[PDB]
Amino acid sequence: ESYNPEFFLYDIFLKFCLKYIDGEICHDLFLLLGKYNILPYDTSNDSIYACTNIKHLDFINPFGVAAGFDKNGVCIDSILKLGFSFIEIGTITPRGQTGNAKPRIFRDVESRSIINSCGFNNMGCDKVTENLILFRKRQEEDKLLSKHIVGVSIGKNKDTVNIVDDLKYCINKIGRYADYIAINVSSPNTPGLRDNQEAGKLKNIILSVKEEIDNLEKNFLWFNTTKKKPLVFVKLAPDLNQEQKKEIADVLLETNIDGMIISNTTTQINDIKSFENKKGGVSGAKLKDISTKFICEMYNYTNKQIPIIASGGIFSGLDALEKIEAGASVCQLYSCLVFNGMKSAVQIKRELNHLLYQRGYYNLKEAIGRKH
Ligand SMILES: Cc1c(C2(c3ccc(C(F)(F)F)nc3)CC2)c[nH]c1C(=O)N[C@H](C)c1cc(C#N)[nH]n1
Ligand SMILES: Cc1cc2nc3c(=O)[nH]c(=O)nc-3n(C[C@H](O)[C@H](O)[C@H](O)COP(=O)(O)O)c2cc1C
Numbered sequence: 001e002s003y004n005p006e007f008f009l010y011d012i013f014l015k016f017c018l019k020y021i022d023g024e025i026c027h028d029l030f031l032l033l034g035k036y037n038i039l040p041y042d043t044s045n046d047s048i049y050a051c052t053n054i055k056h057l058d059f060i061n062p063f064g065v066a067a068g069f070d071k072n073g074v075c076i077d078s079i080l081k082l083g084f085s086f087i088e089i090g091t092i093t094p095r096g097q098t099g100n101a102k103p104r105i106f107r108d109v110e111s112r113s114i115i116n117s118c119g120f121n122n123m124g125c126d127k128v129t130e131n132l133i134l135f136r137k138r139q140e141e142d143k144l145l146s147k148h149i150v151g152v153s154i155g156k157n158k159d160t161v162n163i164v165d166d167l168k169y170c171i172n173k174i175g176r177y178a179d180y181i182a183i184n185v186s187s188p189n190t191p192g193l194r195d196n197q198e199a200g201k202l203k204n205i206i207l208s209v210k211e212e213i214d215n216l217e218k219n220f221l222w223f224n225t226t227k228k229k230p231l232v233f234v235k236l237a238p239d240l241n242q243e244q245k246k247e248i249a250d251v252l253l254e255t256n257i258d259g260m261i262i263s264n265t266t267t268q269i270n271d272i273k274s275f276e277n278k279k280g281g282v283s284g285a286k287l288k289d290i291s292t293k294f295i296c297e298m299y300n301y302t303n304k305q306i307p308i309i310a311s312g313g314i315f316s317g318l319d320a321l322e323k324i325e326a327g328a329s330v331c332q333l334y335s336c337l338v339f340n341g342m343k344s345a346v347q348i349k350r351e352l353n354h355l356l357y358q359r360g361y362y363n364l365k366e367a368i369g370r371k372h
């Protein structure tokens with residue numbers, strides 16, 4: 001029964017890794033297991049009452065893996081088959097990059113938190129597109145992958161002056177293979193990137209990305225799950241004042257963005273002892289309340305018209321329901337996969353289903369935004 005994500009040995013190995021093994025080595029080992037298709041899997045049917053959707057994107061369950069986990073799309077099949085409905089690969093950039101100097105990633109098991117200053121390390125858009133094409137070809141031959149969704153997060157190379165040039169580059173090379181495109185204007189580890197959340201710049205960014213996507217048609221096209229043009233999401237940073245949030249919401253309404261990923265990591269958490277004096281953004285349990293509150297704010301600023309993808313401190317079914325009731329349609333995990341490991345998706349799906357039973361919901365969609 002080594003196939004089973006909850007097999008008792010995985011927790012034993014993970015507890016040991018979390019105590020004694022460098023975080024990036026742990027992540028390399030995970031990707032290596034996925035590379036050779038030797039991760040455990042759960043290909044069981046998911047509850048039809050916990051499915052969700054953003055526009056025509058039909059998620060078989062409400063849990064994906066956030067960006068920055070499989071940056072290069074080399075582990076798509078194996079991560080999905082842990083029990084996730086979708087994965088967001090990237091963030092990718094036109095040219096490859098090795099990222100900031102190491103050590104750059106630190107975990108705090110006690111607070112279930114991570115800090116990272118990675119700096120968009122990836123193989124580059126051209127190589128990651130090849131990896132994603134290989135996955136799409138396997139998907140065409142495997143019915144157990146036919147409904148899974150793959151988004152691509154796109155960004156700029158560190159030295160690029162005009163972000164839009166790099167975003168267009170990625171659209172023109174990988175867009176036809178993506179179910180959605182996530183515009184990353186919120187990493188704290190690329191200088192000047194978050195300035196693109198200013199309303200004027202963001203409006204131009206969104207309109208340019210949508211135009212480039214819309215032009216792919218003009219010049220079987222969609223080799224993705226939906227067989228439709230990718231939806232466009234924006235991923236937002238939680239470190240904004242109220243004026244900025246409202247101005248962003250106005251832009252998202254005017255530009256007809258399909259979804260907002262709330263949120264990226266935060267630079268404002270100061271009370272993790274082992275992280276004192278370290279650069280980078282914080283993920284995990286200490287991000288939950290900040291990011292849930294941000295969901296409530298943006299859900300209201302956008303008048304409930306822009307679907308929300310929740311990211312930040314989601315570990316339990318209860319955390320997931322907090323995000324959904326605050327306004328999210330679907331949830332992304334990252335820190336949960338680090339600290340809970342192979343069982344993450346099976347466990348959290350079970351917890352959420354029981355909570356929907358207990359709370360009286362007919363289905364998950366009934367819960368979206370119920371706090372408001
Ligand atoms: C602990 C962990 C793991 C798991 C793991 C690894 C190895 C094994 C083994 F089979 F070997 F025991 N079991 C489970 C629990 C799933 C994956 N990832 C991490 C991790 O700590 N990732 C850090 C935050 C990271 C992130 C980045 C980037 N981008 N770089 N580094
Ligand atoms: C090591 C690491 C690398 C990440 N890289 C990316 C990235 O490339 N693009 C992105 O949009 N988010 C990236 N993130 C942010 C995560 O996708 C996620 O939004 C964040 O960790 C909050 O979710 P969590 O609290 O569940 O971990 C990264 C996070 C970590 C910890």
Ligand SMILES: O=C(O)c1cc(=O)[nH]c(=O)[nH]1
Binds near residue numbers: 091
């Ligand atoms: O590449 C990174 O450093 C990174 C990107 C991002 O968007 N978020 C994050 O926390 N790290």
